[PDB]
Structure formats: C-alpha cells, structure tokens
C-alpha cells in the first residue's frame, strides 16, 4: 500500500508514534518519506544478502527474519513479510524497539541526513490528526 502523507501521519499517531522516545510525529513521517516514499511494499537488497523492508526500511540481518541469512538476528521477533503489510502495526512496533535502544532515530541515516534539524512539524501540517 502506498500511503498518502496525512493518511500515514494519522495511522502513525493511532499507533502511538507521536512524541515516542522524544520524536514528534513529523520525524516519523519524514523518515518514511525518504526511506520508502510511503510504500509499505518497498524492499531493497544489500550486498550481504540482507534486505530492508517496509515504510521504514528495516534490515533483515538484525530486526526481522526472512530466512535468507541463516544465523542472523530477529530482534523484533517477526517475519520480515509483516513489514510489507498495508497494516503498519508491525513496522511501528519494530521502529519503537529500534529507536528505544539508545541511538534514537540516528539508526535511520536517511532521517539524520534529510529530517533531523528541519521543520519536521511541516510533515503533519494540514492533516486531520
């Protein structure tokens, strides 16, 4: 599913991302924009055989299991396919685990380079939240 900006903002708010770990809602919307362009089915293959999945491009060697890299971690305890669902629950729950381990949103380089320090509130402007 390709979410609309405000549609995604509303879904993320319903799932408790607004101000989660000190990050206002716009941070999450901006991160999703630059990671997946709001497409839940976004995937990207890496040189080590791992794959990044979903709206927040979560990596399979650490956060989820896709069985393609035996011995890898599955810190979010979920099949990577769950991160491609039109229902963003799995992506949100995993993002919460990632952002709360001590590195904040810097875990998403795209967020650090394209969102950090900007007027992130602009991403939820004009939205019915």
């Amino acid at each position: 599913k390709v979410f609309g900006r405000c549609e995604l903002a509303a879904a993320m708010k319903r799932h408790g991302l607004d101000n989660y770990r000190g990050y206002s809602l716009g941070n999450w919307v901006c991160a999703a924009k630059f990671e997946s362009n709001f497409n839940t089915q976004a995937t990207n293959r890496n040189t080590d055989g791992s794959t990044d999945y979903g709206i927040l491009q979560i990596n399979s060697r650490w956060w989820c299991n896709d069985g393609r890299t035996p011995g890898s971690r599955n810190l979010c305890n979920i099949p990577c396919s769950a991160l491609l669902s039109s229902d963003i629950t799995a992506s949100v729950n995993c993002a919460k685990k990632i952002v709360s381990d001590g590195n904040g949103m810097n875990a998403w380089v795209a967020w650090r380079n394209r969102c950090k320090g900007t007027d992130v509130q602009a991403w939820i402007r004009g939205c019915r939240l």
Epitope: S50, L56, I58, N59, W62, D101, N106, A107, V109
Partner: nanobody, 131 residues
C-alpha cells in the same frame, strides 16, 4: 565499549604483521569494527572496516590488495592482516567500532573516508613501524 588491541610492532619493508582487537561492554553490537591509522603529525585516516553482520569488507585505496580485515562476530573481535608492508605504512593503528544498530543496511566503509564518522569507540593505539 572498550577496545583493546595487540600485535603490530616493527618489521622490514615487505614483511607482514597481524593486528587483533577485542571489544568489551557490548551486549548486541557492535555494528561495525574497523581499523584507522595516524602517521606522525598527520590526521587520522581510515584503513579498513567490516560489518559485524554479513561480513562485508571495505578498504582504503592505499591498502587494497595488501591488507585483509576479518572478524569473529560471535566474540566481538576483529583482525587486520598486513602483508607487503612499506615505510609509508608506519603509523599508530587504531581499532574502532560503531555501536549503532542501524535500522536500514549501513555500509561500515562510510566512516573510513569521513573522519571516522559513526565510530564512537576507539582503542588506545598500537604502533606499527616499517623500516
């Protein structure tokens, strides 16, 4: 974390040396383990890096073909085999690590040419001298 390394020393040009490094204080990471070096009076520079997850390796052009970085991710250790050493390789070598568990795939080689950006942990430095 706390990085401790061993090995190195003095050797004649054309010789070989093998550096070892162990990280202590991690529970999940590190995400990256690498080697940097600093010649007398110069700024520190990257040498090689490796992704703890996956084992992808990265090297500075100055050492490609002569140096090989390897690891034991289960024990949070990293190694640097240095063959065909030359006088210009003389410097203080540093073991380094990036503790951030990135969400999306992150190439550990990025910090090699960006002044060690991302590498938050550093060893004390081990001398390597090539005559």
């Amino acid at each position: 974390v706390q990085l401790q390394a061993s090995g190195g020393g003095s050797v004649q040009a054309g010789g070989s040396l093998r550096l070892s490094c162990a990280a202590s204080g991690y529970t999940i990471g590190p995400y990256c383990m690498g080697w940097f070096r600093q010649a007398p009076g110069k700024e520190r520079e990257g040498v090689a890096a490796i992704n703890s997850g996956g084992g992808s390796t990265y090297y500075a052009d100055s050492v490609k073909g002569r140096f090989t970085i390897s690891q034991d991710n289960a024990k949070n250790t990293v190694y640097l085999l240095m063959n065909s050493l030359e006088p210009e390789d003389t410097a203080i070598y540093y073991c380094a690590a990036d503790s951030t568990i990135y969400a999306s795939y992150y190439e550990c080689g990025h910090g090699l040419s960006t002044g060690g950006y991302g590498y938050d942990s550093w060893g004390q430095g081990t001398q390597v001298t090539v005559s």
